[PDB]
Design a protein around this ligand. Structure first.
Ligand SMILES: [Ca+2]
Ligand SMILES: [Zn+2]
Length: 132
């Protein structure tokens, strides 16, 4: 198991939802775990961007996530935050997917509140982190 360290301190409005998203990923996958702490690999920020939330990441643990205020009010914020964290873990956008896919993001609309990755998404993250 590898540990990826995140810094939540620059997204003060989202502390509970970041904790929730980290606990959802930690409860779902075996080969990587997320922990808050110093000398972090990736960081969370907040603000306004009409495009919504986004991730600037290499897809293997590094970079940052921007959490947009409007998207996190109109959609379930746990799903949004867990979704963007999925990009840092290596998973791509799949907007045409159903609500049971976390990586379909906002595609299924604001009635979809599911923040958990499905079995295939879990398997893919485990394989991407199998060798660190
Ligand atoms: Ca929620
Ligand atoms: Zn996405």
């Amino acid at each position: 198991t590898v540990t990826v360290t995140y810094d939540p301190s620059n997204a003060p409005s989202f502390q509970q939802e970041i904790a929730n998203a980290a606990q959802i990923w930690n409860s779902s996958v075996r080969n990587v775990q997320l922990r808050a702490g110093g000398n972090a690999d990736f960081s969370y920020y907040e603000g306004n961007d009409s495009r919504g939330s986004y991730a600037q990441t290499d897809g293997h643990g590094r970079g940052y996530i921007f959490l947009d205020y409007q998207q996190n009010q109109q959609y379930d914020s746990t799903r949004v935050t867990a979704h963007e964290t999925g990009h840092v873990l290596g998973l791509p956008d799949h907007y045409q997917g159903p609500c049971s896919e976390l990586m379909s993001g906002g595609g299924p609309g604001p009635s979809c509140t599911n923040p958990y990755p499905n079995a295939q998404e879990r398997s893919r993250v485990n394989a991407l982190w199998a060798n660190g």
